[PDB]
Amino acid sequence: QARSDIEKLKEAIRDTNKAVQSVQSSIGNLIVAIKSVQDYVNKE
Amino acid sequence: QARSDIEKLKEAIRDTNKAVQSVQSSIGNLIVAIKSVQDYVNKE
């Protein structure tokens, strides 16, 4: 059904968006990790 | 055609998902890189 498939496509994109959001959170923490090493190198 | 477009949307999301999977693999290796520098700083 075109209506069922349209809803399936919507939910698939929703899940892809959630995957991107998780990647975004990971990148925010990678920044923290890089800063930490650089700050550990400067403070000791 | 609505059927042709539904199939096009499906393949577009499939390719977006493959792009996210490549980004996920990159993030896994960024972790390795950060650990390496931190482990190189600790071991020498």
Binding site: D5, K8, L9, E11, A12, I13, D15, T16, K18, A19, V20, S22, V23, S25, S26, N29, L30, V32, A33, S36, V37, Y40 | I6, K10, I13, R14, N17, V20, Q21, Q24, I27, G28, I31, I34, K35, Q38
Partner: peptide, 30 residues
């Protein structure tokens, strides 16, 4: 300190991979 941060990234990466698995399974059913 940094070890905890890297573990968070690993967990968030695992969640991301699972969301893509679900998206692809939905696509397979179209």
């Amino acid at each position: 300190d940094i070890s905890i941060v890297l573990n968070k990234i690993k967990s968030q990466l695992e969640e991301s991979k699972e969301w893509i698995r679900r998206s692809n399974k939905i696509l397979d059913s179209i």
